[PDB]
Amino acid sequence: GVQPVIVEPIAAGQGKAIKAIAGYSISKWEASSDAITAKATNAMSITLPHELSSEKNKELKVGRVLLWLGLLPSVAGRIKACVAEKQAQAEAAFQVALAVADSSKEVVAAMYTDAFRGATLGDLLNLQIYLYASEAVPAKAVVVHLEVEHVRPTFDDFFTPVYK
Amino acid sequence: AGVQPVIVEPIAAGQGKAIKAIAGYSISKWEASSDAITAKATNAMSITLPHELSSEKNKELKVGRVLLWLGLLPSVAGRIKACVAEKQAQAEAAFQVALAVADSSKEVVAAMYTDAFRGATLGDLLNLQIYLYASEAVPAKAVVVHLEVEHVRPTFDDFFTPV
Amino acid sequence: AIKAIAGYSISKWEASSDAITAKATNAMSITLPHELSSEKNKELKVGRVLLWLGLLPSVAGRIKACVAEKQAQAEAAFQVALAVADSSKEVVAAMYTDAFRGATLGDLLNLQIYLYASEAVPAKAVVVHLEVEHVRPTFDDFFTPVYK
Amino acid sequence: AIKAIAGYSISKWEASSDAITAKATNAMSITLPHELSSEKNKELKVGRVLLWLGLLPSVAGRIKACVAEKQAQAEAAFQVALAVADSSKEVVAAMYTDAFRGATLGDLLNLQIYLYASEAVPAKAVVVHLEVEHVRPTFDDFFTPVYK
Amino acid sequence: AGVQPVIVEPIAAGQGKAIKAIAGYSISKWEASSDAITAKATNAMSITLPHELSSEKNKELKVGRVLLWLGLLPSVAGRIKACVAEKQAQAEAAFQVALAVADSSKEVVAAMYTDAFRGATLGDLLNLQIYLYASEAVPAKAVVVHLEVEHVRPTFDDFFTPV
Amino acid sequence: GVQPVIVEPIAAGQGKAIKAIAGYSISKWEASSDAITAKATNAMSITLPHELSSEKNKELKVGRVLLWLGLLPSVAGRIKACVAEKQAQAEAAFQVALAVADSSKEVVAAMYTDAFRGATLGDLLNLQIYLYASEAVPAKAVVVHLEVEHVRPTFDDFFTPVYK
Amino acid sequence: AGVQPVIVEPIAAGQGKAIKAIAGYSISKWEASSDAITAKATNAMSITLPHELSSEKNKELKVGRVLLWLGLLPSVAGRIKACVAEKQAQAEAAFQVALAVADSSKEVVAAMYTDAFRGATLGDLLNLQIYLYASEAVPAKAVVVHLEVEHVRPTFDDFFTPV
Amino acid sequence: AGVQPVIVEPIAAGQGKAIKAIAGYSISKWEASSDAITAKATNAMSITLPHELSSEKNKELKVGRVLLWLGLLPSVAGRIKACVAEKQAQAEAAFQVALAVADSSKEVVAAMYTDAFRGATLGDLLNLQIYLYASEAVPAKAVVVHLEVEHVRPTFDDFFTPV
């Protein structure tokens, strides 16, 4: 038997949300870019937030990583980005990356389901963000957002003992 | 498993499901008109509550989902973008952090904010703004911005004013 | 206070006044809010109607107001109206318990508001408040479909 | 008399008046008592509000008072207030049954009291009494801990 | 019996039990400011009821426990004493017969009168006084005296004034 | 019968830790001071962190508040602090505060079990921190730490939807 | 039958199922770099086994599926094609008989050979070649060719070298 | 409840409970000597692992509780403070953020870090430092700093070196 179906159009920001696995939490932080010359690639380092920068918190395992970039409404051209290891040549990172966020798509994002799974929060300081631009753009024209899924920090529900 | 045959039935404008407000909530709708826009420029306009919800009794109600959709003149040529975000120092920077953008070059010109403002109050919507971008120069009164906000149903409004 | 009948709601709005010459009466039309101006909404039944008016504290003299059908002689409306809001007594209000219970929202466009003053009164000195009870609209708990 | 709803209490205080010029209106702010001025107490819900005022027996002329949101034009408040306490009729009082039922005690700082007189009136001639019903505070049946 | 080992847990300011009023009673609190004090001298100041308890209806309620505690400016140097007693011909003699004295050189600057005034009326507290002593000269508005009095809960105060 | 007991001495930082109530979480942040003249009081405002500064997050209720101050090892004199409402005269805040942290005690801390209970995170911007100094001290000589117990932020375990 | 409504959920790069090797098989991956290409010309490059599979013991294992996918520099402009086929006298003729072509103008730049080489040996992959075509002139080291080959899992490799 | 009478038994030095390491953990102890200290000055000295725990195999073990206690010469006069904290730009600033301070003017000259470093590795203790303060000028070799660290018990240390 044949089955007739109707495909219902969907609006922006109306799709489902991915939920973190049990025992895990999601921390979100964002960094800004700088000036890019036409047909060039820049390297951006990754810096942890202040509360996750302690020796105790740098041994939390990592799960999934999501990379989406927000850009100005008047940016003309194509923008691509990826997260990979540190490389001597910047533009060669796109030849080995398992996911690239491209601005000429419907969904400008990249998902790393198992590329970094099993690493620790201290390992993230060894990676970089590579950013290509088809045309010259000024500084702060693109903002990169990063979501890292990691194990829940054990001590957040306790007051500090008062006898210092 | 075997291959299952499927027929896709085309639909016209105005067909599709309509989202229903959750229990105990109501939906209030109002619209705002825009001003003259310079090309590659962005205008910021404040959200203004309707008169029937601007009292102190009503500005303490919770907020659920917010829907933004905008209707243009048929002769309008170019590209339009719009979003609802916090009050920003830079008008064009709000597109870099917004969770949804209504774009006129797509099939559905709308934007839905499912969880961004869930739990705020109706009085907090006065702290937000609407940012509207145009790629080409646009005259005034050419764009109308529609807002659907669902909120807790007010409790004392089916009473006459005692005299 | 008085509560709405089950399945009914109350709508409230107001209309500003114009200048009045001494011992003269004005004829004002009733304009619905934009939300209730659709064709499907003009068919809703009407229950009770309350008319009260608030003045500037410096207004001197007696003011009267009533709502009735369109009259050829403007001052003749105060002779047939079932309630008149007079500003020289305890309650400046007019309650219409049965005068319109059964009409539709479209019929209110056939009525008019008559205002009277015994001394010259500036513009916007009087604000006429109108509270109409009607049937709750059938579709106000849905978002507009996104695909238009 | 009218009794408070279960779980609710009534707070009463007053504010003295200033000098009024003829056909002029004053703008007064609402100041809470010191006991209800804490942050945890500004979050209590508000029920009914009653405003009545007592005058010196030698005061001549008509006096009016109302409470509403801050207005740019001071005299325009008497056009939108849901109740006005007029001193030329049987009951010099104003009852707000639903106008504020649902707000918080902190919202009363956003309202104001407007007073009107038709002749020059000295200072302290009018005393405005304000009785606000609110939710009973959660901790008023305990002594303060001695170890501070 | 064997020796039982015990650990003592230190506590900071603001920790500890709070005493609850007995059934049918309520607690009302008010404060009074002090005047300039000469060294080795004592000032007597009358107890003044708050406006909400000074009517004839309310001045007939019973009294339970009374708590006195006083808060000083941080820069205040010296020693302060205070007590609540009957109206005395000699100001400094009231310390010889008082059942409790609030002293600023101790860890808890407070005084509790559990049974001294139990059974009196709120109107009788106007016959009493507060005696305040200072070892060194003290300027005005440097000491604030707080009074917690528990009494029978008034019966007709949740009613509006009939109009 | 009489009971003999032994009181065991306890070392620094060895007492029990207070646990947050169900559904609540604890956020910790600290601010530094400035120069103080001998026998004077300063007023310090309270600023929320970035993640709790959104319109959605300013309606979370507050539970307990803990105030402890850390000071340099060479600070000589007495330091007192309190958290109260905004006042016209700064030194008058100590006459009405329900807890004062004093440096001449064994435990330099203050606990507000019910003073602020029931308020919202948006109310904290109306309070201040008052700080007295017996002797003149230079700037940054004392650090105030603040712990606020509030309702758990609802959305932290969800990835942002990818269809922007 | 009635019409069934369906919502399509968009997905981003890196989302989707990953194909699992069959039982008793393992997947080994290696890559090769390309040379300078003239426009409308085709280059032929030999398949070279990694060092860990080039012994006589390992060159006798069976082969299953082979996956070809290639990654380009972001600035590379033009069109690229690639395929794995038998050793051909004419370089460009291998596209006329190949069962799959990886094309850079499509959404998925990859090619899968499910049954073409099923049953061959690892040593037979040295008889095959890779043919790479470019519509425009391309410099060297601009294209990297990745090969995933699944094969029977070697039996004696978890042993140390006896000494 | 009735009043219960209690006798307090005094204890001498060396009496009291000894804390036992949790299951699967072991406690390793070592000491460090100090240098000359100027009055109102602070010295920073690095934590150095003993030789038996400085291998790569052992620097991957978890950490539990850390105990700091320091022993002075009998003739040492003044006041001493010490703490273990992260590596700080300002030496004296580490006392403003430390969770425990060992002070020589108290009955117990020690400091316990129950949860500050729980979950770190033995190799991370090399990133930390010890800050030591003296109110009066102190000569060298006058203070000895003792460290008790509990960690996971190593798995391969009861074996001889194979030869």
PDB file of N, CA and C in Angstrom, chain D residues 35-107:
ATOM      1  N   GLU D  35       8.574  48.851  58.427  1.00  0.00           N
ATOM      2  CA  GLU D  35       8.523  47.412  58.641  1.00  0.00           C
ATOM      3  C   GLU D  35       8.392  46.633  57.338  1.00  0.00           C
ATOM      4  N   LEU D  36       7.755  47.208  56.315  1.00  0.00           N
ATOM      5  CA  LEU D  36       7.514  46.528  55.046  1.00  0.00           C
ATOM      6  C   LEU D  36       8.489  46.962  53.958  1.00  0.00           C
ATOM      7  N   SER D  37       9.576  47.634  54.323  1.00  0.00           N
ATOM      8  CA  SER D  37      10.498  48.194  53.345  1.00  0.00           C
ATOM      9  C   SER D  37      11.663  47.272  53.013  1.00  0.00           C
ATOM     10  N   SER D  38      11.706  46.069  53.577  1.00  0.00           N
ATOM     11  CA  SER D  38      12.780  45.139  53.269  1.00  0.00           C
ATOM     12  C   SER D  38      12.573  44.514  51.892  1.00  0.00           C
ATOM     13  N   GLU D  39      13.648  43.928  51.361  1.00  0.00           N
ATOM     14  CA  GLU D  39      13.578  43.318  50.036  1.00  0.00           C
ATOM     15  C   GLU D  39      12.662  42.102  50.018  1.00  0.00           C
ATOM     16  N   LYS D  40      12.720  41.264  51.053  1.00  0.00           N
ATOM     17  CA  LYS D  40      11.867  40.080  51.086  1.00  0.00           C
ATOM     18  C   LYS D  40      10.404  40.456  51.275  1.00  0.00           C
ATOM     19  N   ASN D  41      10.139  41.635  51.836  1.00  0.00           N
ATOM     20  CA  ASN D  41       8.775  42.091  52.064  1.00  0.00           C
ATOM     21  C   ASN D  41       8.196  42.850  50.882  1.00  0.00           C
ATOM     22  N   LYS D  42       9.035  43.352  49.979  1.00  0.00           N
ATOM     23  CA  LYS D  42       8.536  44.007  48.779  1.00  0.00           C
ATOM     24  C   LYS D  42       7.963  43.023  47.771  1.00  0.00           C
ATOM     25  N   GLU D  43       8.119  41.721  47.997  1.00  0.00           N
ATOM     26  CA  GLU D  43       7.642  40.701  47.076  1.00  0.00           C
ATOM     27  C   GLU D  43       6.275  40.147  47.452  1.00  0.00           C
ATOM     28  N   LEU D  44       5.649  40.667  48.502  1.00  0.00           N
ATOM     29  CA  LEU D  44       4.352  40.160  48.928  1.00  0.00           C
ATOM     30  C   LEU D  44       3.255  40.630  47.984  1.00  0.00           C
ATOM     31  N   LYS D  45       2.276  39.761  47.748  1.00  0.00           N
ATOM     32  CA  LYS D  45       1.173  40.095  46.861  1.00  0.00           C
ATOM     33  C   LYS D  45       0.212  41.074  47.533  1.00  0.00           C
ATOM     34  N   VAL D  46      -0.523  41.810  46.706  1.00  0.00           N
ATOM     35  CA  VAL D  46      -1.417  42.868  47.158  1.00  0.00           C
ATOM     36  C   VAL D  46      -2.848  42.493  46.797  1.00  0.00           C
ATOM     37  N   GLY D  47      -3.770  42.721  47.728  1.00  0.00           N
ATOM     38  CA  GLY D  47      -5.172  42.430  47.496  1.00  0.00           C
ATOM     39  C   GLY D  47      -5.993  43.660  47.162  1.00  0.00           C
ATOM     40  N   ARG D  48      -6.731  44.174  48.137  1.00  0.00           N
ATOM     41  CA  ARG D  48      -7.549  45.364  47.963  1.00  0.00           C
ATOM     42  C   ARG D  48      -6.858  46.569  48.588  1.00  0.00           C
ATOM     43  N   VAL D  49      -7.217  47.758  48.112  1.00  0.00           N
ATOM     44  CA  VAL D  49      -6.671  49.013  48.614  1.00  0.00           C
ATOM     45  C   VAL D  49      -7.823  49.984  48.827  1.00  0.00           C
ATOM     46  N   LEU D  50      -7.869  50.601  50.004  1.00  0.00           N
ATOM     47  CA  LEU D  50      -8.894  51.577  50.345  1.00  0.00           C
ATOM     48  C   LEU D  50      -8.236  52.908  50.673  1.00  0.00           C
ATOM     49  N   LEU D  51      -8.771  53.984  50.103  1.00  0.00           N
ATOM     50  CA  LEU D  51      -8.272  55.330  50.339  1.00  0.00           C
ATOM     51  C   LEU D  51      -9.409  56.220  50.818  1.00  0.00           C
ATOM     52  N   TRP D  52      -9.289  56.716  52.045  1.00  0.00           N
ATOM     53  CA  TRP D  52     -10.218  57.697  52.580  1.00  0.00           C
ATOM     54  C   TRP D  52      -9.407  58.798  53.240  1.00  0.00           C
ATOM     55  N   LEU D  53      -9.993  59.985  53.308  1.00  0.00           N
ATOM     56  CA  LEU D  53      -9.274  61.152  53.785  1.00  0.00           C
ATOM     57  C   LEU D  53     -10.147  61.966  54.729  1.00  0.00           C
ATOM     58  N   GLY D  54      -9.512  62.484  55.777  1.00  0.00           N
ATOM     59  CA  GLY D  54     -10.190  63.289  56.772  1.00  0.00           C
ATOM     60  C   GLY D  54      -9.686  64.715  56.800  1.00  0.00           C
ATOM     61  N   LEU D  55     -10.601  65.678  56.830  1.00  0.00           N
ATOM     62  CA  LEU D  55     -10.240  67.080  56.712  1.00  0.00           C
ATOM     63  C   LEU D  55     -10.469  67.813  58.027  1.00  0.00           C
ATOM     64  N   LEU D  56      -9.851  68.985  58.139  1.00  0.00           N
ATOM     65  CA  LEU D  56     -10.205  69.898  59.208  1.00  0.00           C
ATOM     66  C   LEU D  56     -11.630  70.404  58.994  1.00  0.00           C
ATOM     67  N   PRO D  57     -12.414  70.526  60.067  1.00  0.00           N
ATOM     68  CA  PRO D  57     -13.824  70.909  59.901  1.00  0.00           C
ATOM     69  C   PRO D  57     -14.021  72.289  59.306  1.00  0.00           C
ATOM     70  N   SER D  58     -13.001  73.143  59.317  1.00  0.00           N
ATOM     71  CA  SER D  58     -13.107  74.491  58.778  1.00  0.00           C
ATOM     72  C   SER D  58     -12.751  74.577  57.299  1.00  0.00           C
ATOM     73  N   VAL D  59     -12.419  73.458  56.659  1.00  0.00           N
ATOM     74  CA  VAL D  59     -12.022  73.489  55.257  1.00  0.00           C
ATOM     75  C   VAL D  59     -13.252  73.709  54.386  1.00  0.00           C
ATOM     76  N   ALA D  60     -13.180  74.705  53.512  1.00  0.00           N
ATOM     77  CA  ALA D  60     -14.273  75.054  52.618  1.00  0.00           C
ATOM     78  C   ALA D  60     -13.894  74.739  51.178  1.00  0.00           C
ATOM     79  N   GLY D  61     -14.892  74.336  50.397  1.00  0.00           N
ATOM     80  CA  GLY D  61     -14.681  73.968  49.015  1.00  0.00           C
ATOM     81  C   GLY D  61     -14.710  72.466  48.796  1.00  0.00           C
ATOM     82  N   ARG D  62     -14.472  72.083  47.545  1.00  0.00           N
ATOM     83  CA  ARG D  62     -14.500  70.684  47.148  1.00  0.00           C
ATOM     84  C   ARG D  62     -13.078  70.150  47.031  1.00  0.00           C
ATOM     85  N   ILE D  63     -12.855  68.950  47.561  1.00  0.00           N
ATOM     86  CA  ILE D  63     -11.554  68.291  47.546  1.00  0.00           C
ATOM     87  C   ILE D  63     -11.729  66.937  46.875  1.00  0.00           C
ATOM     88  N   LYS D  64     -10.758  66.547  46.056  1.00  0.00           N
ATOM     89  CA  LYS D  64     -10.772  65.266  45.368  1.00  0.00           C
ATOM     90  C   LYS D  64      -9.400  64.608  45.439  1.00  0.00           C
ATOM     91  N   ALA D  65      -9.400  63.278  45.476  1.00  0.00           N
ATOM     92  CA  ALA D  65      -8.152  62.532  45.550  1.00  0.00           C
ATOM     93  C   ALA D  65      -8.304  61.202  44.830  1.00  0.00           C
ATOM     94  N   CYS D  66      -7.205  60.743  44.235  1.00  0.00           N
ATOM     95  CA  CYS D  66      -7.180  59.481  43.509  1.00  0.00           C
ATOM     96  C   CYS D  66      -5.742  58.987  43.454  1.00  0.00           C
ATOM     97  N   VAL D  67      -5.588  57.697  43.168  1.00  0.00           N
ATOM     98  CA  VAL D  67      -4.281  57.067  43.021  1.00  0.00           C
ATOM     99  C   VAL D  67      -4.213  56.389  41.659  1.00  0.00           C
ATOM    100  N   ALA D  68      -3.120  56.629  40.938  1.00  0.00           N
ATOM    101  CA  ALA D  68      -2.925  56.099  39.596  1.00  0.00           C
ATOM    102  C   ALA D  68      -1.436  56.149  39.275  1.00  0.00           C
ATOM    103  N   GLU D  69      -1.067  55.659  38.095  1.00  0.00           N
ATOM    104  CA  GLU D  69       0.326  55.689  37.677  1.00  0.00           C
ATOM    105  C   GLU D  69       0.785  57.128  37.460  1.00  0.00           C
ATOM    106  N   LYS D  70       2.105  57.309  37.422  1.00  0.00           N
ATOM    107  CA  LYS D  70       2.669  58.637  37.216  1.00  0.00           C
ATOM    108  C   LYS D  70       2.240  59.193  35.866  1.00  0.00           C
ATOM    109  N   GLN D  71       1.752  60.431  35.875  1.00  0.00           N
ATOM    110  CA  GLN D  71       1.249  61.094  34.683  1.00  0.00           C
ATOM    111  C   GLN D  71       2.159  62.262  34.342  1.00  0.00           C
ATOM    112  N   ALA D  72       2.313  62.532  33.044  1.00  0.00           N
ATOM    113  CA  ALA D  72       3.000  63.752  32.634  1.00  0.00           C
ATOM    114  C   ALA D  72       2.151  64.979  32.937  1.00  0.00           C
ATOM    115  N   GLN D  73       0.875  64.938  32.568  1.00  0.00           N
ATOM    116  CA  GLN D  73      -0.084  65.982  32.904  1.00  0.00           C
ATOM    117  C   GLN D  73      -0.771  65.580  34.203  1.00  0.00           C
ATOM    118  N   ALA D  74      -0.575  66.383  35.250  1.00  0.00           N
ATOM    119  CA  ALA D  74      -1.015  65.981  36.582  1.00  0.00           C
ATOM    120  C   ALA D  74      -2.532  65.868  36.669  1.00  0.00           C
ATOM    121  N   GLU D  75      -3.258  66.800  36.051  1.00  0.00           N
ATOM    122  CA  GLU D  75      -4.711  66.803  36.177  1.00  0.00           C
ATOM    123  C   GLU D  75      -5.358  65.683  35.370  1.00  0.00           C
ATOM    124  N   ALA D  76      -4.616  65.061  34.457  1.00  0.00           N
ATOM    125  CA  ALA D  76      -5.169  63.994  33.630  1.00  0.00           C
ATOM    126  C   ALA D  76      -5.378  62.692  34.390  1.00  0.00           C
ATOM    127  N   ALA D  77      -4.901  62.585  35.631  1.00  0.00           N
ATOM    128  CA  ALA D  77      -5.039  61.332  36.367  1.00  0.00           C
ATOM    129  C   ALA D  77      -6.489  61.059  36.743  1.00  0.00           C
ATOM    130  N   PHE D  78      -7.276  62.112  36.961  1.00  0.00           N
ATOM    131  CA  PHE D  78      -8.661  61.929  37.375  1.00  0.00           C
ATOM    132  C   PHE D  78      -9.539  61.396  36.252  1.00  0.00           C
ATOM    133  N   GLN D  79      -9.024  61.334  35.023  1.00  0.00           N
ATOM    134  CA  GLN D  79      -9.794  60.800  33.909  1.00  0.00           C
ATOM    135  C   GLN D  79      -9.662  59.291  33.764  1.00  0.00           C
ATOM    136  N   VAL D  80      -8.598  58.691  34.294  1.00  0.00           N
ATOM    137  CA  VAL D  80      -8.354  57.263  34.128  1.00  0.00           C
ATOM    138  C   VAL D  80      -8.432  56.485  35.430  1.00  0.00           C
ATOM    139  N   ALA D  81      -8.482  57.150  36.580  1.00  0.00           N
ATOM    140  CA  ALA D  81      -8.588  56.441  37.845  1.00  0.00           C
ATOM    141  C   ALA D  81      -9.936  55.741  37.957  1.00  0.00           C
ATOM    142  N   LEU D  82      -9.912  54.531  38.509  1.00  0.00           N
ATOM    143  CA  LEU D  82     -11.110  53.715  38.627  1.00  0.00           C
ATOM    144  C   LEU D  82     -12.011  54.136  39.778  1.00  0.00           C
ATOM    145  N   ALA D  83     -11.531  54.986  40.680  1.00  0.00           N
ATOM    146  CA  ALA D  83     -12.342  55.490  41.778  1.00  0.00           C
ATOM    147  C   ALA D  83     -11.725  56.784  42.280  1.00  0.00           C
ATOM    148  N   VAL D  84     -12.584  57.743  42.614  1.00  0.00           N
ATOM    149  CA  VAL D  84     -12.167  59.059  43.083  1.00  0.00           C
ATOM    150  C   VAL D  84     -12.918  59.381  44.365  1.00  0.00           C
ATOM    151  N   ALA D  85     -12.191  59.867  45.370  1.00  0.00           N
ATOM    152  CA  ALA D  85     -12.779  60.239  46.659  1.00  0.00           C
ATOM    153  C   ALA D  85     -13.138  61.718  46.617  1.00  0.00           C
ATOM    154  N   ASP D  86     -14.424  62.012  46.458  1.00  0.00           N
ATOM    155  CA  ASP D  86     -14.916  63.377  46.330  1.00  0.00           C
ATOM    156  C   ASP D  86     -15.526  63.811  47.654  1.00  0.00           C
ATOM    157  N   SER D  87     -15.248  65.050  48.056  1.00  0.00           N
ATOM    158  CA  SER D  87     -15.680  65.568  49.345  1.00  0.00           C
ATOM    159  C   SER D  87     -16.985  66.345  49.263  1.00  0.00           C
ATOM    160  N   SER D  88     -17.784  66.120  48.224  1.00  0.00           N
ATOM    161  CA  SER D  88     -19.065  66.794  48.062  1.00  0.00           C
ATOM    162  C   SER D  88     -20.204  65.792  47.923  1.00  0.00           C
ATOM    163  N   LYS D  89     -20.085  64.641  48.578  1.00  0.00           N
ATOM    164  CA  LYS D  89     -21.102  63.604  48.497  1.00  0.00           C
ATOM    165  C   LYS D  89     -21.036  62.740  49.749  1.00  0.00           C
ATOM    166  N   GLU D  90     -21.887  61.711  49.782  1.00  0.00           N
ATOM    167  CA  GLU D  90     -22.157  60.997  51.026  1.00  0.00           C
ATOM    168  C   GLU D  90     -20.923  60.284  51.562  1.00  0.00           C
ATOM    169  N   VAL D  91     -20.149  59.652  50.688  1.00  0.00           N
ATOM    170  CA  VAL D  91     -19.016  58.833  51.099  1.00  0.00           C
ATOM    171  C   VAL D  91     -17.757  59.436  50.492  1.00  0.00           C
ATOM    172  N   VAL D  92     -16.879  59.960  51.342  1.00  0.00           N
ATOM    173  CA  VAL D  92     -15.575  60.469  50.887  1.00  0.00           C
ATOM    174  C   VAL D  92     -14.597  59.308  51.025  1.00  0.00           C
ATOM    175  N   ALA D  93     -14.588  58.445  50.014  1.00  0.00           N
ATOM    176  CA  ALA D  93     -13.724  57.275  50.034  1.00  0.00           C
ATOM    177  C   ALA D  93     -13.540  56.765  48.614  1.00  0.00           C
ATOM    178  N   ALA D  94     -12.543  55.900  48.449  1.00  0.00           N
ATOM    179  CA  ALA D  94     -12.246  55.274  47.164  1.00  0.00           C
ATOM    180  C   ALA D  94     -11.851  53.829  47.430  1.00  0.00           C
ATOM    181  N   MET D  95     -12.559  52.889  46.814  1.00  0.00           N
ATOM    182  CA  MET D  95     -12.292  51.468  46.975  1.00  0.00           C
ATOM    183  C   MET D  95     -11.764  50.897  45.667  1.00  0.00           C
ATOM    184  N   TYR D  96     -10.614  50.232  45.732  1.00  0.00           N
ATOM    185  CA  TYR D  96      -9.989  49.598  44.574  1.00  0.00           C
ATOM    186  C   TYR D  96     -10.064  48.088  44.773  1.00  0.00           C
ATOM    187  N   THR D  97     -11.132  47.480  44.257  1.00  0.00           N
ATOM    188  CA  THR D  97     -11.361  46.056  44.452  1.00  0.00           C
ATOM    189  C   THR D  97     -10.445  45.185  43.599  1.00  0.00           C
ATOM    190  N   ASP D  98     -10.231  45.541  42.328  1.00  0.00           N
ATOM    191  CA  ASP D  98      -9.383  44.753  41.442  1.00  0.00           C
ATOM    192  C   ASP D  98      -8.263  45.542  40.781  1.00  0.00           C
ATOM    193  N   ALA D  99      -8.200  46.862  40.957  1.00  0.00           N
ATOM    194  CA  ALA D  99      -7.233  47.664  40.216  1.00  0.00           C
ATOM    195  C   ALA D  99      -5.792  47.277  40.514  1.00  0.00           C
ATOM    196  N   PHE D 100      -5.522  46.690  41.681  1.00  0.00           N
ATOM    197  CA  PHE D 100      -4.164  46.315  42.053  1.00  0.00           C
ATOM    198  C   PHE D 100      -4.062  44.885  42.565  1.00  0.00           C
ATOM    199  N   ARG D 101      -5.129  44.096  42.479  1.00  0.00           N
ATOM    200  CA  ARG D 101      -5.116  42.757  43.060  1.00  0.00           C
ATOM    201  C   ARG D 101      -4.221  41.850  42.229  1.00  0.00           C
ATOM    202  N   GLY D 102      -2.987  41.657  42.682  1.00  0.00           N
ATOM    203  CA  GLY D 102      -2.041  40.830  41.962  1.00  0.00           C
ATOM    204  C   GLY D 102      -0.654  41.430  41.901  1.00  0.00           C
ATOM    205  N   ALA D 103      -0.552  42.735  42.134  1.00  0.00           N
ATOM    206  CA  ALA D 103       0.741  43.397  42.136  1.00  0.00           C
ATOM    207  C   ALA D 103       1.516  43.027  43.398  1.00  0.00           C
ATOM    208  N   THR D 104       2.703  43.604  43.536  1.00  0.00           N
ATOM    209  CA  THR D 104       3.539  43.411  44.706  1.00  0.00           C
ATOM    210  C   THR D 104       3.666  44.725  45.465  1.00  0.00           C
ATOM    211  N   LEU D 105       4.136  44.628  46.708  1.00  0.00           N
ATOM    212  CA  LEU D 105       4.295  45.825  47.526  1.00  0.00           C
ATOM    213  C   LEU D 105       5.323  46.780  46.936  1.00  0.00           C
ATOM    214  N   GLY D 106       6.265  46.266  46.144  1.00  0.00           N
ATOM    215  CA  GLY D 106       7.229  47.138  45.501  1.00  0.00           C
ATOM    216  C   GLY D 106       6.634  47.958  44.375  1.00  0.00           C
ATOM    217  N   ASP D 107       5.515  47.502  43.807  1.00  0.00           N
ATOM    218  CA  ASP D 107       4.884  48.239  42.717  1.00  0.00           C
ATOM    219  C   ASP D 107       4.197  49.505  43.208  1.00  0.00           C
TER     220      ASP D 107
END
